[PDB]
Amino acid sequence: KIEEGKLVIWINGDKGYNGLAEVGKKFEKDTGIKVTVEHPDKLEEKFPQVAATGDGPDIIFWAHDRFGGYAQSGLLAEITPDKAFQDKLYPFTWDAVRYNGKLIAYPIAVEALSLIYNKDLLPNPPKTWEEIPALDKELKAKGKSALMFNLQEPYFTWPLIAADGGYAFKYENGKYDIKDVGVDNAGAKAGLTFLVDLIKNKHMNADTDYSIAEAAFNKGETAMTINGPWAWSNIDTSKVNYGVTVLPTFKGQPSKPFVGVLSAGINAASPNKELAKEFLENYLLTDEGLEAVNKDKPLGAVALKSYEEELAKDPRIAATMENAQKGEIMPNIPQMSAFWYAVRTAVINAASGRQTVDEALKDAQT
Amino acid sequence: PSQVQLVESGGGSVQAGGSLRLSCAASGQIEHIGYLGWFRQAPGKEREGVAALITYTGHTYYADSVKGRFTVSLDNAKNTVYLQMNSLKPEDTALYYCAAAEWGSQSPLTQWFYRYWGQGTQVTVSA
């Protein structure tokens, strides 16, 4: 069904697929095995649809959180890296590709939100959320604002809500306890209350979303935003003299962003599983292999320790990994779906004054 | 199969200055769709965003080249999102796609944000 004795690789069209194809050329130069890289349209739904019929690529690249359900459906093979190879990648990235106790993909890249700041407006950005009100009053006297970021998605607001103790599901030793939910605990209430107080005191506007915040920062109107490495290209085009740093702390504790891990899974239907392992372990997950992909399209931070140490000479990448290591892996379990939609309503309701903080988080835990 | 299905209709040919309405029927488990987008792609060109509707805020965003000419709207009862295209220009010729997402971390104005995609409907404008 899938052709034996070659490799077909699918990766999304926003990634460095030409660099990946070049790694495949090097593999062919050593082994005679042809490696074909594709970036099919509608890849997110195409892979599960085609793989469910026993067809498709040998290797699929996607964010780890979707791979949990692919493994549940029997679409991904368990991978078999030795201890020596596992030691080459950060331990938390292996946790992101663990499902039902089995490793089901190779971690490649790591992304998380960071604090992005305008160096001309704010050379020394605040280390704490608690400083933002006074900083905003200063900047508003100069026709600016301190901070604008997407308040509409819990992906952006949860890092502050998690700082003092909020969480979706308790995660200990690679397993989630879906009976242990921290959406309305004291820490979540503390963080959401600080957020709503920022709005109450006119330091943020409850309507600010992704597009409003991005325009305001790239036009030099606000001193800070919160966003991920996918947004850096637009800020480059704007020529804003920006930096990227650790998220502000809340009550002395780090903001805890969700972490996404671009990962490479092996199709359960592939008759080339050992070839795929050899390509991924010995060619792609090397300094030379990740460099080829990164030179085509930057990966951001990476799961390979050796190459991350090189990339982290860029303080933006060092900040990305620092924030990711202070954050939480995005859960790959289906129970996480209800979290996004419930907390989205809760924050909207608290920020607009339709519910109190305690009422909103109570309904969200409910 | 996909948990959400999107079906575009309404494509056609219009002389420059005229109008045309597209529709996109959404079906399946659509309870948590927070974002509906219209995109277009002509041969030899990158796919580009046309209009984005944020269902839970009502905010609508338009490409600079179509702002003031196109209108995106949602009929929640019919689970159908529309693209009303007024004052059409030859540069609007393309295959038009609707797309949907429950949530996302990236920009709702970009194609990479959207999980579900329709088959596309052809719009041709002549000068």
Side-chain angles (χ1 to χ4, degrees), chain A residues 90-110:
Chain A
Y90 294 102
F92 78 88
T93 69
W94 290 118
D95 287 332
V97 295
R98 192 182 303 277
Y99 187 79
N100 201 22
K102 306 176 180 292
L103 298 176
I104 47 81
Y106 288 91
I108 306 300
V110 174

Side-chain angles (χ1 to χ4, degrees), chain B residues 1 8 20 24 32 35-36 38 40 50 52-53 56 58 63 65 69 71 73 78 80 84-86 95 98 105:
Chain B
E8 303 94 339
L20 188 77
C24 172
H32 302 330
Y35 304 83
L36 293 168
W38 283 101
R40 68 187 179 184
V50 177
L53 168 64
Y56 59 91
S65 61
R69 300 191 295 112
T71 305
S73 61
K78 307 182 179 306
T80 300
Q84 175 65 35
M85 300 183 294
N86 307 307
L95 198 54
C98 61
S105 56

Side-chain angles (χ1 to χ4, degrees), chain A residues 12-14 41-42 44-45 49 66 152-153 155-156 207 209-212 227 230 330 340-341 344 348, chain B residues 1-2 31-32 34-35 47 54 56-57 59 61 102-109 112 115-118:
Chain A
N12 211 20
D14 58 347
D41 252 310
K42 303 132 70 169
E44 187 165 0
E45 296 298 300
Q49 162 117 328
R66 303 298 321 279
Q152 305 307 309
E153 282 294 343
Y155 183 93
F156 287 83
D207 293 319
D209 62 4
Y210 193 107
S211 300
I212 294 170
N227 219 329
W230 56 83
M330 223 173 308
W340 303 116
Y341 195 88
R344 182 160 65 188
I348 282 175
Chain B
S2 298
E31 320 88 2
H32 302 330
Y35 304 83
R47 185 169 305 195
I54 295 172
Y56 59 91
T57 65
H59 284 47
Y61 297 98
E102 290 184 312
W103 72 280
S105 56
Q106 297 186 3
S107 167
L109 317 179
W112 312 116
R115 170 172 179 180
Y116 303 107
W117 288 85

Side-chain angles (χ1 to χ4, degrees), chain A residues 53-320:
Chain A
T53 71
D55 210 333
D58 299 279
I59 299 174
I60 176 66
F61 283 75
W62 204 262
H64 77 280
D65 62 288
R66 303 298 321 279
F67 279 179
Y70 295 0
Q72 183 66 28
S73 298
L75 271 39
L76 295 179
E78 178 180 19
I79 63 164
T80 58
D82 301 318
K83 289 181 170 182
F85 185 85
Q86 292 177 243
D87 294 341
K88 288 192 169 68
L89 281 55
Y90 294 102
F92 78 88
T93 69
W94 290 118
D95 287 332
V97 295
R98 192 182 303 277
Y99 187 79
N100 201 22
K102 306 176 180 292
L103 298 176
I104 47 81
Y106 288 91
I108 306 300
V110 174
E111 71 181 11
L113 295 169
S114 295
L115 182 69
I116 304 177
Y117 66 103
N118 185 321
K119 301 184 181 188
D120 298 342
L121 243 30
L122 192 66
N124 298 281
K127 291 294 188 175
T128 72
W129 278 96
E130 286 86 349
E131 290 162 82
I132 292 177
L135 182 61
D136 183 69
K137 194 171 70 182
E138 286 183 79
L139 287 164
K140 262 159 187 182
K142 306 204 310 154
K144 305 300 186 177
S145 69
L147 169 69
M148 301 182 64
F149 69 101
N150 182 10
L151 303 184
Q152 305 307 309
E153 282 294 343
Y155 183 93
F156 287 83
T157 56
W158 200 253
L160 164 64
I161 299 171
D164 193 38
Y167 56 89
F169 309 102
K170 177 58 69 168
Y171 183 68
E172 302 200 292
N173 197 18
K175 301 175 188 175
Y176 294 97
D177 186 349
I178 58 180
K179 295 184 177 297
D180 189 348
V181 177
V183 173
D184 70 339
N185 62 30
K189 288 171 179 180
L192 183 56
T193 294
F194 189 84
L195 182 72
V196 176
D197 279 342
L198 285 175
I199 295 165
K200 175 186 72 179
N201 293 129
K202 303 291 193 292
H203 303 304
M204 293 192 312
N205 187 310
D207 293 319
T208 300
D209 62 4
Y210 193 107
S211 300
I212 294 170
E214 180 178 37
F217 187 82
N218 294 3
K219 281 198 255 285
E221 305 181 346
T222 189
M224 292 177 281
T225 192
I226 293 169
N227 219 329
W230 56 83
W232 294 349
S233 298
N234 274 5
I235 319 182
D236 294 337
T237 302
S238 76
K239 307 305 170 180
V240 161
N241 180 26
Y242 72 103
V244 183
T245 192
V246 58
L247 290 161
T249 64
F250 177 61
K251 298 177 65 178
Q253 303 159 98
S255 294
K256 301 183 77 67
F258 290 107
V259 181
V261 177
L262 180 70
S263 303
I266 296 171
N267 193 333
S270 169
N272 306 296
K273 293 190 184 68
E274 288 298 323
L275 284 178
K277 175 179 177 184
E278 173 166 31
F279 175 81
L280 289 171
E281 286 189 16
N282 301 334
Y283 288 77
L284 179 55
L285 280 169
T286 66
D287 291 343
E288 284 188 21
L290 292 183
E291 178 179 43
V293 178
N294 190 77
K295 285 188 182 301
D296 189 28
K297 272 264 193 303
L299 292 159
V302 301
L304 190 67
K305 294 176 187 175
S306 63
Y307 195 52
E308 171 66 16
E309 290 167 26
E310 175 66 19
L311 289 180
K313 296 179 179 179
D314 186 344
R316 304 175 305 164
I317 301 182
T320 298

Side-chain angles (χ1 to χ4, degrees), chain B residues 12-127:
Chain B
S13 299
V14 192
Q15 178 157 355
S19 62
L20 188 77
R21 194 191 75 183
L22 309 185
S23 70
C24 172
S27 65
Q29 303 315 117
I30 60 144
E31 320 88 2
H32 302 330
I33 294 304
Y35 304 83
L36 293 168
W38 283 101
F39 293 80
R40 68 187 179 184
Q41 183 160 11
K45 311 180 188 304
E46 306 264 1
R47 185 169 305 195
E48 63 158 334
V50 177
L53 168 64
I54 295 172
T55 62
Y56 59 91
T57 65
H59 284 47
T60 48
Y61 297 98
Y62 299 92
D64 296 339
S65 61
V66 312
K67 188 171 182 185
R69 300 191 295 112
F70 295 4
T71 305
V72 60
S73 61
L74 214 201
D75 187 325
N76 312 81
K78 307 182 179 306
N79 306 299
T80 300
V81 57
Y82 297 90
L83 186 70
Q84 175 65 35
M85 300 183 294
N86 307 307
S87 299
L88 277 159
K89 298 176 180 175
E91 73 196 55
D92 299 323
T93 299
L95 198 54
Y96 280 67
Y97 298 88
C98 61
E102 290 184 312
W103 72 280
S105 56
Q106 297 186 3
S107 167
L109 317 179
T110 61
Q111 65 182 125
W112 312 116
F113 180 94
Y114 290 87
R115 170 172 179 180
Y116 303 107
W117 288 85
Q119 0 68 63
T121 191
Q122 178 71 42
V123 176
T124 303
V125 192
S126 60

